[PDB]
Amino acid sequence: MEKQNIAVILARQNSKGLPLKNLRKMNGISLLGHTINAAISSKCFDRIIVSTDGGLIAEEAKNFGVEVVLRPAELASDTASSISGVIHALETIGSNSGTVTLLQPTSPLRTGAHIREAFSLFDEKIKGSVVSACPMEHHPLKTLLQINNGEYAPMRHLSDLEQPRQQLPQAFRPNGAIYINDTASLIANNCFFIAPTKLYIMSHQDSIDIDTELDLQQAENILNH
């Protein structure tokens, strides 16, 4: 079968952090709508699929002119991985060759231009992932993790907690906005991070993601500049 560049936007309906998160408006347009417009305007995709369990989400997808894949509940639950949804979408439309890009609606400031730029890093021959990421304001080695009840362990070393920032390995946060992969490689590896992975750097600002009403407010302030 022929190579196709698919955009898959996973957008479950019953979001727990904030009700109907993927439909929440930000400057008059839904989170879903922002990512769809970004996919459309990027002009990188032969097909744009929104995958959802919910008719409210499906209905919004249709009004933006894009295809919809209906997910069974097990693939939309709070424990479901993104990979299982994207694979399910690929199986439904019958694509296993070309490129598949995950575009999460939680990243409203990611634009068509970002998608274009990310694509120019993707290499048809080598077929490693392109993943959008931003540098971090606070180094993740300088953290404690809960191990039992009332015990906290350092991420790696106790000494790392007190290391001058610059002595530590450079750290990047994948921001959720863009994950580009060779489709067959995605299917084979069953993950979004495939060697050799290139990072597409976005500003911490443009990497804002929505968990809360505040995040939404703040993204709106950012957009208006």
Ligand X SMILES: Nc1ccn([C@@H]2O[C@H](COP(=O)(O)O)[C@@H](O)[C@H]2O)c(=O)n1
Ligand Y SMILES: CC(=O)N[C@H]1[C@H]([C@H](O)[C@H](O)CO)OC(C(=O)O)=C[C@@H]1O
Residue 152 binding partner per list ligand Y, Cl ion, a copy of itself, none, with a CB distance cut-off of 5 to 8 Å that depends on partner kind: a copy of itself
The torsion angles phi and psi of 183, rounded to 5 degrees, stand at -55, -50
Residue among 166, 125, 126 at smallest CA distance from 142: 166
Residue 218 interacting with a copy of itself (CB under 8 A): no
What is the distance between the alpha carbons of residues 154 and 197, in angstroms, rounded to a whole number? 27
Q: What residues have CB less than 8 Å from 51, skipping those under 6 apart?
A: 8, 9, 10, 11, 68, 69, 70, 71, 85, 86, 88, 89
Residue 189 interacting with ligand X (CB under 6 A): no
| 54 token code pair | 């919910």
Residue 82 interacting with ligand Y (CB under 6 A): yes
CA atoms within 13 A on the CB side of 58: 8
How many residues comprise the chain? Answer: 225
Measured over the CA atoms of residue 208, residue 177, residue 26 and residue 112, the dihedral's sign is positive
Q: Which is nearer to a copy of itself, 66 or 103 (CB)?
A: 103
Given 192, 206, 215, 219, the residue binding ligand Y (CB under 6 A): 192
Measured over the CA atoms of residue 203, residue 204, residue 205 and residue 210, the dihedral's sign is positive
Residue 192 interacting with a copy of itself (CB under 8 A): yes
Which stretch in 42-50, 51-59, 119-127, 189-197 sits in contact with a copy of itself by CB under 8 A?
A: 189-197
Given 29, 161, 171, 199, the residue binding ligand Y (CB under 6 A): 161
Q: How far is the CB of 22 from ligand Y (least distance, A)?
A: 12
Cβ(32)–Cβ(60) below 8 Å: yes
Given 30, 42, 99, 104, the residue binding ligand X (CB under 6 A): 104
Residue 105 interacting with ligand Y (CB under 6 A): no
Given 8, 80, 130, 216, the residue binding ligand X (CB under 6 A): 80
Residues that bind ligand Y (CB under 6 A): 81-82, 102, 104, 142, 161-162, 164-165, 174-176, 179, 192, 209
Q: What residues line the site for ligand X (CB under 6 A)?
A: 10-12, 15, 22, 76, 80, 82, 85, 104-106, 165, 176
